[PDB]
Each structure stands twice: as C-alpha cells, then as structure tokens.
Amino acid sequence: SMFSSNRQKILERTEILNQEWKQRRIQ
Amino acid sequence: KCKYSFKCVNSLKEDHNQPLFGVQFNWHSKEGDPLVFATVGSNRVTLYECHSQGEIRLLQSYVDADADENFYTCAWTYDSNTSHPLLAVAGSRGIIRIINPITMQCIKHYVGHGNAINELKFHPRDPNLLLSVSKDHALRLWNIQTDTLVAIFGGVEGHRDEVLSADYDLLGEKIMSCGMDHSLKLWRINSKRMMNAIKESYDYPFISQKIHFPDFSTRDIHRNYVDCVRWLGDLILSKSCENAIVCWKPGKMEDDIDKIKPSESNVTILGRFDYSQCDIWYMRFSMDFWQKMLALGNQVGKLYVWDLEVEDPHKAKCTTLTHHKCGAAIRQTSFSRDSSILIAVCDDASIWRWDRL
Ligand SMILES: COc1cccc(C[C@H]2C[C@H]3Cc4c(cccc4OC)C[C@@H]3N(C)C2)c1
C-alpha cells in the first residue's frame, strides 16, 4: 500500500528527528 | 474518519493593523519549557508565550529601523555552541536578520539576495543551514556558523519567476521549491557535489556553488502560482489559486524518489484535499511535527483541518474551525510541537488560539 508504506517512512524519520530533539544538550 | 476537535480560547490584534504573513512556534524548546511563537508582518517581529486557560503573554517585539520593510517569513533554529534559540526573519527588503529572542535584537544580517525573500527554512539536522527563497528566481543555502553562501539554486534550468515556497524533506537530503512560473523543482543536497560544498563552508572570499540544473521539474500539477510546498514522506503536498492541496509524486506510481532521473516527464496525482473560498494568492498550509494533521486558513477566516492518518482525502476532513469575529484572511497557521495548540494569523493583524480537545 502506497499509504501504509509512506506512513511508516514518516514514522521512522520523524522518530529519528524526535530522538535528536530529546538528546539535545542545553545551557 | 477524523477525531480532532479544537476550542477557540483567545484572540488579540497587533497595533500596526497590517497583515501578518507568518507564524511559527519554536519546535526546538525542550519538553516542559514555555510554548513560544513568533509572528511577522509590517516592519515587526513579535514573540508570545502560551499559558494555561488560553492566556497569550506578549514577551517582546522587534521594530525594524526601516519603516518601509515588510517581513514575510520567520524560522527558528538554535546556536550549536550556546544552545540558546535563534530566530531568522526576512521579507520585501531581501535582508535576512538573525534575532536573538532573549533581547529581541538583530545580532547579524545577510545582504546579497537580488530582491524580496518569500520564505526561510532551517535544515532539519543541521541548525546552521538556512534556506532562503527569493523574488530574483533563486534559492540560496547559507551556513550561519561561518557566514558563508554555500549554494545558489537557479539559472539555466532554474525558476523563471519568483520562488514562493520550498521545503527540506525529513532527513534533509533534498529540497522541493515552487513559484509564480507554475513549476515545482527538486534539488538534491545529498549529492557528492553538495555534501562537499557544505563540508567546505565549515572549513572556511568563499566560492559558492551555482546549481543551474534541478533533479526534477514539473509544471503538470497546478495552472497558476504555486504559493506553498511541503514534503509528505516521499510524496509532496502543494497548492495554488484553485481551492485544493494536491498530493503528488515525481514519476510513476511505483517509481522511487531516489531512482527518479532529472529528465523524468511523469507525475502521479495521489489525491486532493478540497476546500472553498481560498482563491486568493499567498496562503500557506501547515502540518504538525508528526505529520498527522494538515491545516489551512481561507480568505473569509475559516480554518480547515485534516487527519493525515485517514487514506481518502474526503473522509480525512475535521470540523472546520470558525469564529464569528474571525472573518479576515488567515495567511498562515502553526501547531505547537505537541499538537495541543493551533495559532492562526490574519490580514487585519489578528491572532487566534485554538486548543485541542
Ligand atoms: C502568507 O503566504 C505566502 C505565500 C507565498 C509567499 C509569501 C510572501 C509573499 C507576500 C505577498 C503579499 C502581497 C503581494 C501583493 C499584493 C498584496 C499582498 O498582500 C495581501 C505580493 C507578496 N508576494 C510576492 C510575496 C506569502
């Protein structure tokens, strides 16, 4: 499915971004 | 079927009474930190904090010394060294200003762009890589750490009229641009040429790359100005004058985005998100961080929201957000990082806060 596969790519790639946001050093 | 519900909890109007063209929440602030958004319009840049019970707390405002300046866009980043937030702004004067939000002062500026800057975007992985799209038909990639112009995307096979919008994909490997020439163009930044160009801007007059040829080009989606473009995974969402956001992809239904050749002639229209009374140029659509929601304001002050997790773009429709005092054109909307708040900015300098239910 075009939808199911595209949704999984968004899921994995936003997860990678979210992890980087979580890890981010401050002050 | 869509489940998302919102309640209008507050509104205000900025004293300049001029159109607000841009709104952006800071998606870099960490969990628990105050929810902050910036608005842009006229010669002003304004910061607000979102508090409980729909309270919208004014933090500070930047008033440009040039009264004739009209800001069109803003984008958030962070200083990779100090870790503190930074805000980029630009418009009609073609000058990129890097504001420190703590003091709301211009700490460095970039000139060069032949004219007005229509949109700014920060790279999703590198906080130093700023993309600007201009009235001069070109896109420019900047490194705000070394103050270098990494690349100019335009020329021989570049845009033929104003570049109106552009978006990096999720991993920051490629940009999709759009404008007044009706075309959407692909620019790969994960090429050996570009990766080395970026690496060289960090080693640093610097010699900018001139990217005359895009990696894909189509004029088969819209029949008027393309004012907004955003990636949806490997697919693209774009809009024009025509009351629809079109979901499409370069090549054939089964073709891979990374297997597309620069001469590819096919496009596949996967779907259309239909709405009404948004037949005026210069109206942005937005998505939330997880790309589960899609929002667009119309010219009579109605706010459309769709559920991107429902396959058919007819059943995807949420209930339209409306308020009898909100009748002016909604130029742009912004979701807070956690999708709990939706801000809409208008042609009459009004701001509207909608909290999720
Ligand atoms: C908010 O969505 C946008 C989508 C794409 C690009 C932009 C920046 C644009 C702002 C435009 C505003 C405008 C123009 C002419 C007459 C009245 C006007 O204001 C009601 C020309 C400007 N344009 C060429 C650049 C905004």
Residue numbers in the entry:
A (entry chain B): 40 to 66
B (entry chain A): 77 to 280, 288 to 440
Which text from the study accompanies this structure?
Polycomb repressive complex 2 (PRC2) is an essential component of the epigenetic machinery, regulating gene repression primarily through methylation of histone H3K27, which leads to changes in chromatin structure and thus exerts influence on key biological processes such as embryonic development. The minimal core PRC2 complex is composed of three protein components: the catalytic subunit EZH2 (Enhancer of zeste homolog 2), the WD40 domain comprising EED (embryonic ectoderm development), and the VEFS domain comprising SUZ12 (suppressor of zeste 12). EED contains seven WD40 repeats and adopts a canonic β-propeller architecture with the ‘top’ portion for H3K27me3 binding and its ‘bottom’ portion anchored to the N-terminal helix of EZH2. The recognition of H3K27me3 by EED and the resulting increase of the methylase activity are believed to be crucial for the cellular function of PRC2 in propagating the repressive marks at the chromatin loci.
To elucidate the binding modes of EED396, EED666, EED709, EED162 and EED210, we determined the crystal structure of EED in complex with each respective compound at high resolution. The crystal structures were solved using a EED-EZH2 peptide (40–68) complex, except for EED396, which was determined using apo-EED. Similarly, EED210 also showed a good binding signal to immobilized EED (40–441) in the SPR assay with a binding affinity of 35.1μM. As illustrated by the biochemical results, all five compounds do indeed bind directly in the H3K27me3 pocket. The phenyl moiety of EED666, the furan moiety of EED162, and the methoxyphenyl moieties of EED709 and EED210 all make cation-π stacking interactions with the guanidinium group of the Arg367 side chain, with the characteristic face-to-face orientation. While the central rings of EED666, EED162 and EED396 form π-π stacking interactions with the side-chains of Phe97, Tyr365 and Tyr148, those of EED709 and EED210 are involved in cation- π and Van der Waals contacts. The amine group of the octahydrobenzo-quinoline moiety of EED210 forms cation-π stacking with Tyr148 and Tyr365. However, they exhibit significant induced conformational changes for residues Trp364 and Tyr365 (with a movement of the respective side-chain of more than 5Å), moderate changes for residues Arg367, Glu238, and Met256, and minor changes to residues Phe97 and Tyr148. Together, these changes result in the formation of a much deeper pocket as compared to the original aromatic cage found when H3K27me3 peptide is bound. The manuscripts for the optimization results for EED210 and EED162 will be published separately.
